[PDB]
Amino acid sequence: GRATKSIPPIAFPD
């Protein structure tokens, strides 16, 4: 669920 929209965006499936 963690997806930071700062680039480059790091999104984790949790």
Side-chain angles (χ1 to χ4, degrees):
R2 292 169 296 149
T4 312
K5 298 166 178 181
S6 187
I7 63 176
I10 50 177
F12 307 98
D14 64 275

